[PDB]
Design a protein around this ligand. Structure first.
Ligand SMILES: *[C@@H]1O[C@H](CO)[C@@H](O[C@@H]2O[C@H](CO)[C@@H](O[C@@H]3O[C@H](CO)[C@@H](O)[C@H](O)[C@@H]3O)[C@H](O)[C@H]2NC(C)=O)[C@H](O)[C@H]1NC(C)=O
Ligand SMILES: *[C@@H]1O[C@H](CO)[C@@H](O[C@@H]2O[C@H](CO)[C@@H](O[C@@H]3O[C@H](CO)[C@@H](O)[C@H](O)[C@@H]3O)[C@H](O)[C@H]2NC(C)=O)[C@H](O)[C@H]1NC(C)=O
Ligand SMILES: *[C@@H]1O[C@H](CO)[C@@H](O[C@@H]2O[C@H](CO)[C@@H](O[C@@H]3O[C@H](CO)[C@@H](O)[C@H](O)[C@@H]3O)[C@H](O)[C@H]2NC(C)=O)[C@H](O)[C@H]1NC(C)=O
Ligand SMILES: *[C@@H]1O[C@H](CO)[C@@H](O[C@@H]2O[C@H](CO)[C@@H](O)[C@H](O)[C@H]2NC(C)=O)[C@H](O)[C@H]1NC(C)=O
Ligand SMILES: *[C@@H]1O[C@H](CO)[C@@H](O[C@@H]2O[C@H](CO)[C@@H](O)[C@H](O)[C@H]2NC(C)=O)[C@H](O)[C@H]1NC(C)=O
Ligand SMILES: *[C@@H]1O[C@H](CO)[C@@H](O[C@@H]2O[C@H](CO)[C@@H](O)[C@H](O)[C@H]2NC(C)=O)[C@H](O)[C@H]1NC(C)=O
Ligand SMILES: *[C@@H]1O[C@H](CO)[C@@H](O)[C@H](O)[C@H]1NC(C)=O
Ligand SMILES: *[C@@H]1O[C@H](CO)[C@@H](O)[C@H](O)[C@H]1NC(C)=O
Ligand SMILES: *[C@@H]1O[C@H](CO)[C@@H](O)[C@H](O)[C@H]1NC(C)=O
Lengths: 423, 91, 200, 50, 44
């Protein structure tokens, strides 16, 4: 018969980082394998349509990355804008909304994220080219700005249909109802909630700035792609048993009937290298597709709505979420309600008043030692136990641990005070 | 035709010197040659009007076949992300 | 074979922590500090979660407890009796064992060389022909290794998907109550209990 | 105008089994391909950084 | 949209008017007081 009831709370903002896309690459085998050699190209024709398979696989990956970005970010029908007056009931969204001053209309956090992660193809070029993404960073920033404006000005209604305006304190009161806390808790503690949220956003900025390994996932994706390409280019210097790794030396030194043998050795080596590279790219692209599907689900369920899934949209009872763009990824700021300062109480399943058992409608019976109250479970707010607060079912002889206490019916008291006397 | 990852000046100098390898030539009117980050686009008239993306080229630029200035030609354009909507937020 | 970073004792300790938390505090330890609650009250609130009033549990508390205990006994009997109960984990182990067996057995292949034993090649022949035979063998063994690594990468992707699903199940079924149909068992989800198993 | 209402219930405990990890393996190619042979190792160097 | 008269059955009370930001004065119609009045205000 012991229960710990929260008496305070904390608005905790956490960060999740999800890769969405990967560098798009295109590879011409005829240059990589046999660069600027007709002879080696004729020898390469004998290996069949391996090049068609490699080209198709890389093109599929390239289209898939644009598809990933489109699925994660282009979930909004209309580019929404915040009002000219940036007042939202004391909530300061200046660090997540676009900064109009700078040449790029990105929030300060987006600028930090983009700075942290790091037409001449100077490096790695042996037929390897990098195709640009279909959506520039400005377009992704515009989509993210639309998402912030929509969620700030209309809550979940823009996700579920037309964007219906609502004052932000009312939106947060309804999210409070969503987690299981009454609206008066927010409205009575509005200033505290706003201050906690603003401090949390400041701590998010400080945490992203300070920790070098904050954005390790996106940098890991970039590093893996850079490695893969470096290894692919470096395999050209290998001989694979041939007299030389330079095709021009082979063609300059030897007649055809032995240059063909050496060039066939080299072709086998380079084809093996390309097949390995394409296979690793396909596997990593599958991984990034899984990550992008997760990011799209997070955008749908955390940003465009409120999620009852535990730990899906941050640690704690999910209140709301804010997306931010990052190079080849998305960063969700998960705003959650964390109970705090729990207090010790005695509890009972039901209250025996007149031989009838009384159960809470929405709450739990608690006791401060001397008196019994009904309180909502996620915040301590003791109330007098009344027939309006409880419902009756059965008698006192069935429930285990039932405790005798008075249940105050209002109507009987009122009728007594009203016309007991009549004269 | 998009020549990927090359400046339009280099492609033009290659065409005039007959160095460029694909022997076919897309006729250049002087207004249908456009520079994108994806490469040099020859044969499409860039327009300031923004439309929903139809044929993605890259770097925010798409292209589509549209009835422009009365005859139909391939135009290139920066894609529109969507219609704007200013929510009537108030206290 | 490299050992896992968490021994079976550490996984058992984590699972014990999860059981103690969910038994003594319900969903509150998942969502923040662990707030104690009597277990009948916790199950009454889960009953409210599925759409059944608290008095249904409190009036039928003994029946619910007896049904739960009988169900756990049937779980023990079902796991003990059925040989194919744990087929997934055994399948993972069998696939890894196969892959390694095939990788080792590819060494006995010649791939066109005069012998599969490198020492025989080096003992019999001079360099300029032992090199040819050893290059044939190198090509064969490199192909075998590439195939093995590719299968391991694909299977590792599959196991990563399975582990992500398991983590989501731990988050939503154990640390809370899920309204997702058939996600946390068949029927209206009341609660869940994790147990460790080899590689799962 | 017909509805079936439950009058009793059953507390059903079911089992789900999910793999989480797989045996970790490490492979030295220089032993597998060319075990204890310098000559084969020099030949293997020509294949690059596989 | 389904407008209803604001009543004590429709709302719940917590705190006083000096705390909530943007509170608006308006009548909340309790049914029981009105009924008791109509019922036996006079007695004769
Ligand atoms: C619930 O917790 C919140 C904090 O999460 C409590 O509000 C905090 O109250 C303390 C003590 O009154 C404040 O500290 C004081 O703040 C000012 C700062 O200028 C200064 O005068 C003092 O030096 C002292 O540090 C603290 O600022 C305040 N926090 C916020 C965000 O307002 C609140 O009282 C708790 N409620 C209950 C019922 O326990
Ligand atoms: C929302 O919070 C942000 C902080 O995240 C507030 O930004 C504040 O902006 C000013 C510049 O506009 C920052 O610098 C200050 O400027 C003047 C220069 O004359 C001076 O008074 C100070 O010495 C300071 O340098 C200021 O540091 C920054 N605030 C913080 C905490 O860093 C913004 O004002 C907030 N918006 C609302 C509506 O509260
Ligand atoms: C709802 O279903 C439960 C069972 O799921 C019913 O409880 C069961 O009632 C039967 C008949 O009374 C019990 O069988 C008897 O049990 C004892 C065992 O020692 C024995 O005296 C008899 O030989 C007979 O087998 C059964 O044990 C009991 N089950 C449990 C778990 O308590 C319950 O009556 C049903 N309620 C309604 C309203 O239909
Ligand atoms: C338990 O709560 C009750 C009600 O809040 C406390 O009793 C009240 O104490 C205040 C003290 O200022 C008095 O003004 C009220 O008149 C009391 N009300 C009643 C109904 O007695 C009680 O003291 C609390 N007990 C403990 C141990 O916390
Ligand atoms: C709640 O009050 C009832 C009486 O209203 C208690 O029931 C009595 O319990 C005593 C125990 O010695 C019996 O001798 C009486 O015959 C009972 N009377 C009735 C009318 O049932 C009950 O025990 C009280 N419960 C608690 C927890 O205090
Ligand atoms: C709601 O009505 C109350 C009175 O019932 C108003 O409170 C008065 O406000 C005036 C403002 O000039 C003061 O001079 C009075 O002393 C206040 N009286 C009391 C009893 O508080 C209140 O301002 C009204 N609120 C709104 C929004 O109209
Ligand atoms: C609550 O009170 C009991 C004694 O009534 C005590 O044993 C227990 O430790 C208290 N709870 C906490 C969290 O301290
Ligand atoms: C193409 O070259 C010109 C100078 O010849 C340069 O100004 C321009 O920036 C180049 N185009 C791109 C896309 O860099
Ligand atoms: C909301 O009220 C505040 C009060 O300080 C005011 O500054 C702000 O302009 C108001 N918002 C709108 C949209 O009128």
């Amino acid at each position: 018969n012991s229960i710990a009831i929260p008496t305070n709370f904390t608005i905790s903002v956490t960060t999740e980082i999800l890769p969405v896309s990967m560098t798009k690459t295109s590879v011409d085998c005829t240059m990589y394998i046999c660069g600027d050699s007709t002879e080696c190209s004729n020898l390469l024709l004998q290996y069949g349509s391996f090049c068609t398979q490699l080209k198709r696989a890389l093109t599929g990956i390239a289209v898939e990355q644009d598809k990933n970005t489109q699925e994660v970010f282009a979930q909004v029908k209309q580019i929404y804008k915040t009002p000219p007056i940036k007042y939202f009931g004391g909530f300061n969204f200046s660090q997540i909304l676009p900064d109009p001053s700078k040449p790029s209309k990105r929030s300060p956090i987006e600028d930090l994220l983009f700075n942290k992660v790091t037409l001449i193809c100077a490096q790695k070029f042996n037929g390897l080219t990098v195709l640009p993404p279909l959506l520039t960073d400005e377009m992704i920033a515009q989509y993210t700005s639309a998402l912030l404006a929509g969620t700030i000005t209309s809550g979940w209604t823009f996700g579920a249909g037309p964007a219906l305006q609502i004052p932000f304190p009312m939106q947060m009161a309804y999210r409070f109802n969503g987690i299981g806390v009454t609206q008066n808790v927010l409205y009575e503690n509005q200033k505290l909630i706003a201050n906690q949220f603003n401090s949390a956003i400041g701590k998010i900025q400080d945490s992203l700035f300070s920790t070098p390994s904050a954005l390790g996932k996106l940098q890991d994706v970039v590093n893996h792609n850079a490695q893969a390409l470096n290894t692919l280019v470096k395999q050209l210097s290998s001989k694979f048993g041939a007299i030389s790794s330079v095709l021009n030396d082979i063609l300059s030194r030897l007649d055809p009937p032995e240059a063909e043998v050496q060039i066939d050795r080299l072709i086998t080596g380079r084809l093996q290298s390309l097949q390995t590279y394409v296979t690793q790219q396909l596997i990593r692209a599958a991984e990034i597709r899984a990550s992008a599907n997760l990011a799209a689900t997070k955008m749908s369920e955390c940003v465009l709505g409120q999620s009852k899934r535990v730990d899906f949209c941050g640690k704690g009872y999910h209140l709301m979420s804010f997306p931010q763009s990052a190079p080849h990824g998305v960063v969700f700021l998960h705003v959650t309600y964390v109970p705090a300062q729990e207090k010790n109480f005695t509890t009972a399943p039901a209250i025996c008043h007149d031989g009838k058992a009384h159960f809470p409608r929405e709450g739990v019976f608690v006791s401060n030692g001397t008196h019994w109250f009904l309180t909502q479970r996620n915040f301590y707010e003791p109330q007098i136990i009344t027939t309006d607060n409880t419902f009756v079912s059965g008698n006192c002889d069935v429930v285990i641990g039932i405790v005798n206490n008075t249940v105050y019916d209002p109507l009987q008291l009122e009728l007594d005070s009203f016309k007991e006397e009549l004269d | 035709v998009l020549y990927q990852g090359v400046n339009c000046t280099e492609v033009s100098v290659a065409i005039h010197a007959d160095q460029l390898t694909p022997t076919w030539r897309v006729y250049s009117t002087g207004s249908n040659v456009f520079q994108t980050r994806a490469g040099c686009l020859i044969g499409a008239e860039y327009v300031n009007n923004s439309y929903e993306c139809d044929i993605p080229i890259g770097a925010g630029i798409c292209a589509s076949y549209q009835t422009q200035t009365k005859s139909q030609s391939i135009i290139a354009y920066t894609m529109s992300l969507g219609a704007e909507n200013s929510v009537a937020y108030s206290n």
